[PDB]
Design an enzyme around this catalytic site. Structure first.
Site, PDB file in Angstrom:
ATOM      1  N   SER A 341       3.060 -12.146   4.751  1.00  0.00           N
ATOM      2  CA  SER A 341       1.814 -12.516   5.424  1.00  0.00           C
ATOM      3  C   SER A 341       2.154 -13.426   6.644  1.00  0.00           C
ATOM      4  O   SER A 341       3.299 -13.891   6.752  1.00  0.00           O
ATOM      5  CB  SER A 341       0.860 -13.188   4.441  1.00  0.00           C
ATOM      6  OG  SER A 341       1.327 -14.446   3.988  1.00  0.00           O
ATOM      7  N   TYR A 342       1.191 -13.649   7.578  1.00  0.00           N
ATOM      8  CA  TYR A 342       1.418 -14.439   8.805  1.00  0.00           C
ATOM      9  C   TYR A 342       2.115 -15.776   8.483  1.00  0.00           C
ATOM     10  O   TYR A 342       1.569 -16.573   7.713  1.00  0.00           O
ATOM     11  CB  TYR A 342       0.134 -14.653   9.645  1.00  0.00           C
ATOM     12  CG  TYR A 342       0.456 -15.049  11.070  1.00  0.00           C
ATOM     13  CD1 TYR A 342       1.282 -14.254  11.866  1.00  0.00           C
ATOM     14  CD2 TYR A 342       0.012 -16.254  11.596  1.00  0.00           C
ATOM     15  CE1 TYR A 342       1.639 -14.646  13.154  1.00  0.00           C
ATOM     16  CE2 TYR A 342       0.354 -16.649  12.890  1.00  0.00           C
ATOM     17  CZ  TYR A 342       1.170 -15.843  13.661  1.00  0.00           C
ATOM     18  OH  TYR A 342       1.508 -16.217  14.934  1.00  0.00           O
ATOM     19  N   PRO A 343       3.361 -15.963   9.007  1.00  0.00           N
ATOM     20  CA  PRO A 343       4.160 -17.154   8.674  1.00  0.00           C
ATOM     21  C   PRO A 343       3.860 -18.446   9.453  1.00  0.00           C
ATOM     22  O   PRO A 343       4.622 -19.404   9.341  1.00  0.00           O
ATOM     23  CB  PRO A 343       5.567 -16.686   8.986  1.00  0.00           C
ATOM     24  CG  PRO A 343       5.393 -15.796  10.125  1.00  0.00           C
ATOM     25  CD  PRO A 343       4.131 -15.050   9.872  1.00  0.00           C
TER      26      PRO A 343
END
Ligand code: MG
Lengths: 619, 205
Positions: A341-343
């Site tokens: 997922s978006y880091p």
């Protein structure tokens, strides 16, 4: 806003121009929405392709023209008249007119967006869902609105590149947030003004004062890079100032068949030889130890908390030995490829919407952690350890899809993110803590014991260590002869130089480097040679780095302190929330930094005096 | 002639606080208290109080009246019995590093100094004197009435059975009583900052 409002708005739309942050994101999003049926086409930029595909948006069959930019499409700078260093006094840069322009290498992209806008009736922004991503989105909007001023602009919100996420983004298009874009424009402006004014001032001055040492060298200043350097110089000075002291302690050991038991003095240690010598002399005459208290209680080791950017950047450095700049590069690559997922998130709370049971199930094909993932499911299901933060945009960093095809550091960080996620969704390690208090001539000594009963999360998370320290059986009331009764010497140890995770921790604590920008500023002070890494590998300040910090700090006002940047970054968060406007923040921050600049120019000779300590004479 | 008032004050000083004073100091002291309160004829109760207040402010080193027994420093180990109203010249905590202590005292913030990314009962060492011999007093058991901020020259009663070793008294709370007072000459030199600065090797001390 509503489904009827959107369907009405979409009517008569035939072609929808979609723009992503990079080509790999465009190829990926287009492949998932089209089911590989997409048709590739060429743009005016060879590295930024067009992927046309038929799709159904709010009850209207459209042709999606999916293209991309290559990060920021527009560059900010002063007008040509102020651009030359010898063209104006650095002080005027606090008021000098600033303009946004498209660089020569990005003009092909600007021209592709303009070209496609002519054939398209709507624009959907598919840039990453962070502050920079919203600013890039507004750069794309400005370019396309120049062609069609009445162009319908929508924004696709997503935290992962997976078929369900990108499909849901199409069913839930929203309006582009001008507030978060404005906060980026404010930060960009302040960084240019404070950066340029202070850089030109010190570079030109120090090049005149120390010509043989700093010839053609750039002495740059950053509103965030300066307090970052300040932490490194502050720690070095702490070590330099530290006075070690000799202490004394009574060590009592007792030998057992398969191990020596060491009882630790309840007085711990004394910074006086005569005080300890007297107590030790009392112990040699009548050294018969009596078991006072044999106490035992359950001890537990907590499973990791849900992962956010800071904990990833710090644990990858400490545990995997990957520096934050690389971690964020790999993390973005795994995100783009659909594996995590978006880091870039502050969230350490798993939202109720998110199905953790599926994410765990997905990891069961793995030979290493598969059995553990199954174990969570068999034991009722995932029970995450959530924190207290939520950006209300992204979930904690977690694996979104299973892959066994990764190599090198990409595999190491994915494996880390998977193991942490499973460990978090697991149970805490449960053990048994024991303590044996002994009396020797009215002096109390204590031996400690640990026996782990259920390792739990430790079976998937090798990055944490818990080990059994099994003590022999001691009955309450027993009497025994200790193996040795010693009077050993010790010394107090100074702090150590900062590691990257230690430096990130200090930056976090003081509220600077917010919005996952820690690495960028640590990298700048590394690159400008203000700091250097020891073999250990800790941060050691250079003579120019050292001299600048003690030069400004000697001027009276504590400039190396992160308080002013923390206030700047705090104001930027207010702009995003609509809690403050961009015009008051700009006027206030510029007035604040112009004042600090004017005071620094007045006491400019302090910089010369602090660096003279290292470079000697110079005029 | 204040020798009649001196015997009555001497009786009270010993009876109430176990304070022993030389006759010449005591007579000189009464005479001064009489000059100070010239307008009145003070009661023995007021005289006894004012004499004791002057004693609390007196440097025992300047009194030349031995209290502690002879060769107490010559005996390697033993037990001390009786009542002694001594004086603390200096005092320090040996359970904590002097550098750590001086930092806190100097009020400087060392929070960033103990920041890492990775997830002790007090013992005061008293310098006691009867004005002739100097010995050490150790907080063997927690004595809460004693604290590091006690003014140099503070008078304390040391009583009961007290075990001593290598010139160090092993004091328990049941053996200590703080009388008060201070010595101006000692406040200067043995202030807590100066005591600690010496233990970390700071110059001009
Ligand atoms: Mg980005």
């Amino acid at each position: 806003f509503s489904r009827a409002a959107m369907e009405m708005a979409l009517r008569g739309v035939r072609k929808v121009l979609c723009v992503a942050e990079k080509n790999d994101a465009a190829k990926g999003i287009a492949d998932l929405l089209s089911n590989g049926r997409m048709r590739r086409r060429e743009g005016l930029s060879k590295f930024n392709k067009i992927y046309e595909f038929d799709y159904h948006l709010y009850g209207q069959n459209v042709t999606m023209v999916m293209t991309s930019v290559s990060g920021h499409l527009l560059a900010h700078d002063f007008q040509m008249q102020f651009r030359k260093w010898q063209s104006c006094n650095p002080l005027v840069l606090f008021e000098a007119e600033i303009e946004k322009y498209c660089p020569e290498n990005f003009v092909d992209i600007k021209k592709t967006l303009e070209r496609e806008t002519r054939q398209c009736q709507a624009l959907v922004i598919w840039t990453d869902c962070d502050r920079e991503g919203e600013n890039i989105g507004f750069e794309i909007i400005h370019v396309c609105k120049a062609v069609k001023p009445n162009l319908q602009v929508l924004r696709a919100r997503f935290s992962e590149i997976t078929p369900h996420a990108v499909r849901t983004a199409c069913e839930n298009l929203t309006e582009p947030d001008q507030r978060v874009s404005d906060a980026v424009d404010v930060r960009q402006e302040l960084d240019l003004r404070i950066g340029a004014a202070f850089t030109r001032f010190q570079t030109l001055r120090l090049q005149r004062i120390f010509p043989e040492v700093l010839a053609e060298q750039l002495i740059s200043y950053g509103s965030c890079q300066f307090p970052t350097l300040g932490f490194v110089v502050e720690r070095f000075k702490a070590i330099q100032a530290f006075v070690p002291e000799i202490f004394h302690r009574i060590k009592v050991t007792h030998d057992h068949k398969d191990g020596i038991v060491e009882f630790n003095w309840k007085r711990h240690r004394l910074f006086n030889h005569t005080a300890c010598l007297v107590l030790y002399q009392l112990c040699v005459e009548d050294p018969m130890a009596t078991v006072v208290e044999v106490r035992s209680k359950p001890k537990s080791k907590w499973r990791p908390q849900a992962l956010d950017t800071v904990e990833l950047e710090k644990l990858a450095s400490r545990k995997l030995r990957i520096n934050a700049k690389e971690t964020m590069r790999i993390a973005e690559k795994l995100y783009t490829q659909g594996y995590i997922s978006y880091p870039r998130t502050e969230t350490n709370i798993f939202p109720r919407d998110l199905n953790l049971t599926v994410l765990v199930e997905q990891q069961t094909p793995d030979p290493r952690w598969g059995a553990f993932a199954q174990s969570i499911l068999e034991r009722g299901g995932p029970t995450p350890r959530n924190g207290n933060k939520s950006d209300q945009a992204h979930p904690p960093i977690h694996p979104t899809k299973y892959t066994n095809n990764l190599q090198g550091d990409e595999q190491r960080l994915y494996e880390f993110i998977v193991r942490h996620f499973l460990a978090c969704c697991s149970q805490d390690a449960q053990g048994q803590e024991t303590t044996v208090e002994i009396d020797i001539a009215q002096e109390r000594f204590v031996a400690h014991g640990l026996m782990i009963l259920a390792r739990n999360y430790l079976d998937v998370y090798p990055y944490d260590h818990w080990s059994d320290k099994i003590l022999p059986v001691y009955e309450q009331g027993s009497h025994f002869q200790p193996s040795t009764v010693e009077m050993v010497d010790g010394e107090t140890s100074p702090p150590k130089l900062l590691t990257e995770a230690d430096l990130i921790a200090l930056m976090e604590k003081h509220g600077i480097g917010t919005d996952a920008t820690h690495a960028e500023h640590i990298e700048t002070i590394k690159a400008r040679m203000y700091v250097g890494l020891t073999p250990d590998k800790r941060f050691l300040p250079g003579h120019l780095g050292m001299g600048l910090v003690e030069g400004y700090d000697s001027m009276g006002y504590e400039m190396s302190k992160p308080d002013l940047r923390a206030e700047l970054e705090a104001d930027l968060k207010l702009i995003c929330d609509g809690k403050k406007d961009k015009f008051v923040v700009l006027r206030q921050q510029v007035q604040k930094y112009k004042q600090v600049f004017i005071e620094a120019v007045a006491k400019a000779k302090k910089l010369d005096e602090a660096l003279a300590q290292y470079f000697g004479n110079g005029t | 002639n204040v020798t009649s008032i001196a015997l009555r004050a001497e009786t009270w000083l010993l009876a109430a606080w176990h304070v022993k004073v030389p006759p010449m100091w005591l007579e000189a002291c009464i005479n001064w208290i009489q000059e100070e309160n010239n307008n009145v004829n003070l009661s023995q109760a007021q005289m006894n109080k004012q004499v004791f207040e002057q004693w609390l402010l007196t440097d025992l080193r300047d009194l030349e009246h031995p209290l502690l027994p002879d060769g107490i420093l010559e005996i390697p180990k033993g037990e001390l019995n009786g009542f002694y109203a001594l004086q603390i010249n200096s005092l320090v905590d040996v359970s904590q590093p002097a550098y750590s202590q001086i930092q806190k005292l100097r009020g400087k913030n060392t929070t960033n100094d103990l920041v890492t990314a990775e997830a002790p009962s007090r013992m005061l060492m008293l310098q006691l004197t009867d004005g002739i011999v100097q010995i050490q007093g150790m907080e063997y058991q927690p004595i809460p009435i004693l604290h590091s901020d006690l003014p140099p020259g503070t008078k304390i009663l040391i009583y009961g059975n007290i075990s001593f070793r290598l010139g160090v008294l092993l004091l328990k709370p049941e053996n200590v009583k703080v009388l008060g007072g201070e010595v101006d000459a000692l406040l200067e030199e043995y202030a807590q900052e100066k005591v600690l600065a010496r233990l970390i090797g700071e110059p001009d001390l």
